[PDB]
Ligand binder design. Sequence first.
Ligand SMILES: O=C1c2c(O)c(=O)ccn2N([C@@H]2c3ccccc3SCc3c2ccc(F)c3F)[C@@H]2COCCN12
Ligand SMILES: [Mn+2]
Ligand SMILES: [Mn+2]
Length: 182
Amino acid sequence: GSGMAMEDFVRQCFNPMIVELAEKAMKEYGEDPKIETNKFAATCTHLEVCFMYSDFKHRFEIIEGRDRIMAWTVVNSICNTTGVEKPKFLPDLYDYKENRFIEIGVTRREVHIYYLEKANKIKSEKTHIHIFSFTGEEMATKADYTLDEESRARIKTRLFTIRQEMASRSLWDSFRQSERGE
Ligand SMILES: O=C1c2c(O)c(=O)ccn2N([C@@H]2c3ccccc3SCc3c2ccc(F)c3F)[C@@H]2COCCN12
Ligand SMILES: [Mn+2]
Ligand SMILES: [Mn+2]
């Protein structure tokens, strides 16, 4: 259940491309993945979900996984060619079919609680929110889940698998409790 154990878990259970992008994002925002090991795992998990979401004719542009400048450059380019309003906060994806940005949330807590937190932090009723748990639960803006049932099933399964792999190593309890502060 240690810090070293969690860092080792992350580097073993996530593909090297995900790990590298997560490390770069954490450094960009001033956090050390060797100290904030649960956050390291959280960023890898969330990045993987974004990449799995964008697979499932490229319907989706991935904003996440890019450095800050390139992320906003992509966002501005989309807004210039679609007239969609520029979001105040960086989103995770752009849906070319529905022509809307998407914010992806992954939570170790109840989805309704996290969904409210997300909706409150953005306040822009134009970014579509989609929350996943590690328990197979899901909540999205207007109960519009965007993807088909099978695509969401595989994301839920992968998240549950991560949870079980953590639990087998006694890492899940720590990971769960670090999402929200005291
Ligand atoms: O893109 C995100 C982001 C999300 O998209 C999200 O859903 C939750 C959280 N985020 N944050 C991610 C992040 C992403 C995934 C899981 C946990 C965290 S926790 C804060 C943090 C993030 C990235 C690097 C870092 F050092 C951080 F401390 C930051 C929020 O500022 C815009 C960029 N960003
Ligand atoms: Mn993001
Ligand atoms: Mn997100």
